[PDB]
Structures are given as C-alpha cells and as structure tokens.
Structure 1
Amino acid sequence: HSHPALTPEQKKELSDIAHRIVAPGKGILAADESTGSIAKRLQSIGTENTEENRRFYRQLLLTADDRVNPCIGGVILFHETLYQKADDGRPFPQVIKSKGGVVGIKVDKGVVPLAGTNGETTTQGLDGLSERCAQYKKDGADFAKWRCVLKIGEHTPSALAIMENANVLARYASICQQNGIVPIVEPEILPDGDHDLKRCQYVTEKVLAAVYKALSDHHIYLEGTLLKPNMVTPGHACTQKYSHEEIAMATVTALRRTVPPAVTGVTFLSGGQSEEEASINLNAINKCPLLKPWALTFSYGRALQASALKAWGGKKENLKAAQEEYVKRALANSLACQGKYTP
C-alpha cells in the first residue's frame, strides 16, 4: 500500500529548486568550511582565526563581480555564515539571493568511527534535523549537504560501511525532503592509497548502487535531489599515469551504470585535486561521447577559492585582485560545465 511522502506541490517546489541549482552553465560554490578546516587554511596563509577574518573572507567570496551571476547557481554556507551580515547591511543569504543564487547549508555533525572495522567512519547529525531544517528554511536555505567518508584499502570499504552510510544518507534525504529542502547526497570516496582506475570504478559502482537502493527503500523523491560524487581517479600513491579521457570515460561509465536519469544533476568534487586539473577533468567529462541524461556540473570547495585565498594574503587592500582570481576560476568552471573549456 502506498502512502505518499510528498504532495504534488512539494514535489513541484523541490523539482523547481533542484532545476534552478544545476541550470546549464551554473555550478556550486562550497564555502561550508568549518572552524578547524578554515583554521588550518588561515594558518597556511599566516593569519589569526577570528570571526571578523572569516566574515571578511566570505565577504570576498560572496560579494564578487557580477560576471559570476551565470556561473554560481548555489552556495553552501556554514551555520554561522547564515547569521552573519555584510558591511553594507545585507545578511549573506540576501547577498546570495540578490544576484540569482540559492542558499545552502552544511548540516552534518562530523564523522564517528565504526567499531570492528579498519578505520571506517560513519556520519553524525540526525538528531533535531527536522526542527533545524525548518529553521534554515525560514532563514532562506533551500538546499542542504551531507558528507559521508569511504576509503579504499585492503578489504575496505566493507558491506557494513556502505550499508550504514547509504542508510544514513537516505534518512537525511527523507528528513530534508519533508521540510522542502533539496538534499545533496555526497558519498565521497577518498583518493588516498595506491589503486588504479578499475578498482576506484568498482568501488564507485558498488557504493552508488547501495546508495540508490537505500534511496529507493526510503521513498525519496529522486527528481528533487542532487548527487555529489567524486571523480573516478587513481590513488595518490598509484604509479600509473592516466590521460584525462580515460578518467572521464571511467567516471561517465561508473555513473551511467548506476544513476537513474530522474536525478536532476551531478555535482562533482575537487577531492584534493589541483585548481586547473579539476576544470580540465570536468571539461573532459562533459566532452565524453556517451549519452549523459543529467546535469554535469561542479561543486568545488578548494578548486574555486585556493588562488583567491593565496592572492588575498590576509590583507584588505589586495581584495579585488583576490576576487579577480576567484572570478577567473568561476568563469573557467562554467565552461567546464558546458564542454567549451580550453586552457
């Protein structure tokens, strides 16, 4: 017997938000760095960690030139950044919505170790998620993000890790879709270790298959979700070298065997890659001569803002220059969304 989890109006608004995010040529900026990760990033540049420094850095990211308006369709924020205001007086959700963006929020509470496994982790943050999601929906957040970690090792990932992460992702997506918030499912597979394209493709297919089976078990409206996978790439210690066409073929082949075409868009990770090779690989993925029935776009945390963070230096007078670097990367990644990129 069928009891509908969503009314057709809820399905319509979720599909409308999900189509607005991964619109052709647009992508996602991931400004969701928590205090420890952004503390390490501000320590690398050599500045102290203060609320004013983080607010100024996200001012540099969010208040850029108007040329990024058909570049960034969605912005993932922290919980703190939702309640911070710009110096003009507008709060950051209004700054995002003023120039055509969609406000997001990273809603997980970190990783917990799984007992009995070889360093496998699950994700935390399911308690109070309905009240928090209603509160973020009142504050302008229209989509969310949840990050699961899986690593390739000797016998890892086991069935327990993939099963638990798929169940937690489906529970998260159900709770988010009850409150009118488009969930972004992110089964990140770590590129650590030494493993070729074939094993990474195998693990990607198994993890994505268990994820979509768990999404089918929990009555998830697949047209109002987004997928956030990592590109099928060799490990860091792998000695064999692969062309970008082989990486793109492995990624599109691992995606086409699992992902149903009702899913609205696919937003790739950077995943420890360089700033230029991520756009090169995304341009190669969008140039693969297969039939890809979804949006292939970017959700880059480091690969959008690393050059801007370097050219900033913690000094205010460098601002525009740093912003210009960011704008450059955004423009490049927009062409990487369309297959029209060339370096």
Structure 2
Amino acid sequence: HSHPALTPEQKKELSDIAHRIVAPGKGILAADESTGSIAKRLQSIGTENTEENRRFYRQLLLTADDRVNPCIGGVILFHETLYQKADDGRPFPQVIKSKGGVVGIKVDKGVVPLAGTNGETTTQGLDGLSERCAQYKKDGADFAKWRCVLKIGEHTPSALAIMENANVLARYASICQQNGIVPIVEPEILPDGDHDLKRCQYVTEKVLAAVYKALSDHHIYLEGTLLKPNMVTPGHACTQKYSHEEIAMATVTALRRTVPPAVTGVTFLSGGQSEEEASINLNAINKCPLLKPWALTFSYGRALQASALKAWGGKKENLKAAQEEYVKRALANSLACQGKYTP
C-alpha cells in the first residue's frame, strides 16, 4: 500500500529549493568547517583559533563583492555560524539570503568505527535530527549536508560498509525532507591509496547503486535531493597518469550508469585536488560529449577559499586582497559549471 511520505505542496517546495541551488551557473560554497578543521587551517595560516577569528574569516567569505552573486547558489554553514552576526549587525543567514544564496547546514555528528571491518567507518547523528531540522528550518536553513566516508582498500569497501552507510544516508534524507529541508547526499570515496581509475569507477558505481536503492526503500523524493559525489580519479599513490578528459569520461560514465535522471543536480567535491585542477576537471566534465540529464556543478570547501585564506594571512588590512582571490575562484568555477571555462 502507499501512504505518501509527502503531500504535493511539500514536494513542490522541495523541488523549488533544489532548483534554486543548482540553477545554471551556480554552485555551493562549503563553509561548514568545524572548530577542529578550521583550527588546523587557522594554525596553518599562523593565527590563533578563536570565535572572533572564525567569525571574521567567514565575513571575509560571505560579505564578498557582488560579482559572486550569479555564482554562489548556496552556502553550507556549520552550526555556530548560523548564530553569528556580521559586524554590520545582520545575521549571516540574512547576509546570504539577501544576495540570493540558499542556506545549508552540516547536520552530521561525525564518523564512528564499524567493528569487525578494516578501518571502515559509518556516520553518526540521527538522534533528535527532526527537532534540529525544524529549528534550522525556522532559522533560515533550506538545505542540509551529511558526509559519509568510504575508503578504497585491499578488500574494502566491504558489503557492510556500503550497506550501512547507504542506510544512514537514506534515513537522514527521509528526516530532512519530512522537515522541509533539501538533503544533499554525500557518499565520499577517499582518494587515499594507489588505484587506477578503473577501480575508482567500479567502486563508485557500486556505491551509488546501493545509495539509490536505499533511497528507494525509504520513499525518498528524488526531485527534492541533490547528489554530492567525488570525481572519479586515481589514488594519490597511483603511478599511472590520466588526462583530464579521461577523468571526465570516467566520472560522467559512472554517473550515467547509476543516478536516475530525476535527481536535480550533482555537486562535486574538490577532494584535496589542487585549487586550479578542480575547475579544470569540472570544466572537462561539463564538456563531455554525452547526455547528462542533471545539473553538474561544484560544492567546493577548499578549492574556493584556499587562495583567499593564504592571502588573508590573519591580518585585517589584507581583507580586500583576500576577498578578491576568493571572487576569482568563484567566477572561474562558475564558468566551469557551464563548460565555458578556460585557464
């Protein structure tokens, strides 16, 4: 029997949000970095990690020149950041919504080991997620992010890791759509190790097949979701070399064999790639001569903000300089998601 998880109105608002985020030329900035990660990078830049340095840096990103308006379609925020105000006095959610962004938030609590496997983990944080999503929805967040991690290895990813992570993703997405928030499904496959494209493509296809079977079992409405996979690339330790067109063909091919066309958009990870290489690979993807029935765009945490971070140095007078670097990357990646970018 069918007991519809969503009424037509709910479905309509979900699909509307999802189309706003990936609307042509637009992509997602990931500011979601937790105090641990942003602690690492603020230590890299040689500045102390304090609430004020974090807030100021995220002003540097969020307050950037209007030239980024037809670029950033959504901004993923960490919890704390939703409740911080810009020094002008506006809360960051209103700063973002004002210039046309959509607010996301990172709802997962991190990774937990799976016992009996080899270094494999699952993801955490389904408790109280519905009340949290209701609260974030009241606070202006229109989409959510959840990150599950899979590593290619000797005998890994195991069937248990794939099954379990797919199930948690689908359960997460169910809750989010019940509360009116577009889930972004992120089954990241770590580049670590030495493996050729063919194996990353094989594993990627298996993972995405399991993910969409799990989303079917949980009655997820696909027009109200986004997919956030990793580009198909060889491992860091792989000696063989691959042209960008081979990486593009492997990625698009892996997507066409799994992701059903109803999915609204596909927002790729940078995944430790070079800041410039990310936009080149994304461009090559959007130039692939196959039929891609969804929006292929970017969600870049590091690949957008690396140069801005290094150029800021933790000194406020560098502000303008820093932001300019950021703007550059944004524009570039915008061109990238349209296939019109050239270096």
| Structure 1 position 342, deviation (Å) | 0.2
Aligned-partner SS, 1:155: coil
- Answering whether residue 124 of structure 2 is matched by residue 124 of structure 1, we say yes
TM-aligned CA deviation for residue 241 of structure 1: 0.4
Structure 1 partner of 2:140: 140
Cα distance per residue 1:163-209 (max 9 Å; x no partner): 00000000000000000000000000000000000000000000000
Distance 2:95 2:104 in 1: 13
- Distance in 1 separating the partners of 2:103 and 2:289: 33
In 1, the alpha carbon distance for the partners of 2:119 and 2:53 equals 35
- How far is the alpha carbon of 1:103 from its aligned partner? 0.4
Separation in structure 1 between the aligned mates of residue 232 and residue 258 of structure 2, nearest angstrom: 14
- CA offsets per residue over residues 271-295 of structure 1, 9 Å max, x none? 0100000000000000000000000
Correspondences of 1:128-207 after superposition (within 5 Å)? 128-207=128-207
CA distance in 1, matches of 2:221, 2:21: 16
Tell me the alpha carbon deviations over residues 79-106 of structure 1, each in whole angstroms, 9 at most, x when there is no partner: 0000000000100000000000000100
Shift in Å, 1:324: 0.1
- Offset of 1:146 from its aligned partner? 0.1
What whole-Å deviation, never above 9, does each CA across 1:260-318 have from its counterpart, x for those lacking one?
A: 00000000000010000000000000000000000000000000000000000000000
Question: Separation in 1 of the partners of 2:129 and 2:52?
Answer: 28
Q: Give per-residue Cα distances to partners, 1:57-96, cap 9 Å, x unaligned.
A: 0000000000000000000000000000000010000000
Q: Deviations over 1:197-254 (max 9, x none)?
A: 0000000000000000000000000000000000000000000000000000000000
Extract structure 1 runs of 4+ deviating beyond 3 A. Answer: none
* TM-score between the two structures when normalised by the length of structure 2: 1.00
Inter-partner Cα distance in structure 2 for 1:321 and 1:46: 18
Q: Please report how far the alpha carbon of residue 154 of structure 1 lies from its aligned counterpart in structure 2 after TM superposition.
A: 0.3
Cα distance in 2 for residues equivalent to 1:59 and 1:157: 39
Matched residue of 2:79: which SS?
coil
State the alpha-carbon separation in 1 of the partners of residues 263 and 75 from structure 2. Answer: 20
Give the Å deviation of 1:133.
0.1
Q: Which residue of 2 aligns with 1:19?
A: 19
Percent of aligned positions that are identical: 100
Distance in structure 2 (CA, Å) of the matches to 1:233 and 1:301: 18
Aligned residue number for residue 70 of structure 1: 70
Which residues in structure 2 correspond to 1:78-117 (within 5 Å)? 78-117=78-117
Whole-angstrom CA distance in 2 between matches of 1:114 and 1:43 = 31
Q: Distance in 2 between matches of 1:333 and 1:91?
A: 27
TM norm structure 1: 1.00
Secondary structure of the corresponding residue to residue 145 of structure 1: strand
List per-residue Cα deviations over 1:18-74 (Å, max 9, x = no partner).
000000000000000000000000000000000000000000000000000000000
Q: Secondary structure at the match of 2:182?
A: coil
CA distance in 1, matches of 2:297, 2:156: 29
Three-state SS of the structure 2 residue aligned to 1:183 is: strand
- Tell me the secondary structure at the aligned position of residue 131 of structure 1: helix
> Alignment partner of 1:103: what SS?
strand
3-state SS of paired residue (1:193)? coil
C-alpha deviation, 1:329, in angstroms:
0.1
CA distance in 2, matches of 1:23, 1:118: 40
Alignment coverage as a number of residue pairs: 343
* C-alpha distance in structure 2 between counterparts of 1:308 and 1:211, whole Å: 35
The 1-side partners of 2:273 and 2:34 are apart by 20
Aligned-pair CA distance for 1:340: 0.2
Per-residue deviation, 1:159? 0.3
- Distance in 2, matches of 1:224 and 1:242, equals 35
Cα distance in 1 between the residues matched to 2:331 and 2:2: 46
Instruction: Report the secondary structure of 1:112's partner residue.
Output: strand
Alpha-carbon distance between aligned partners in 2 of 1:278 and 1:110, rounded to the nearest angstrom: 25
In structure 2, what is the Cα distance between the partners aligned to 1:277 and 1:229? 17
Instruction: Report the counterpart of residue 224 of structure 1 in structure 2.
Output: 224
C-alpha separation in 1, matches of 2:180 and 2:284: 34
Q: Which runs of 5+ in 2 are unaligned?
A: none
Cα distance in structure 2, aligned partners of 1:182 and 1:66: 26
SS of corresponding position for 1:288: coil
Q: What is the CA-CA distance between 1:323 and the residue it aligns to?
A: 0.1
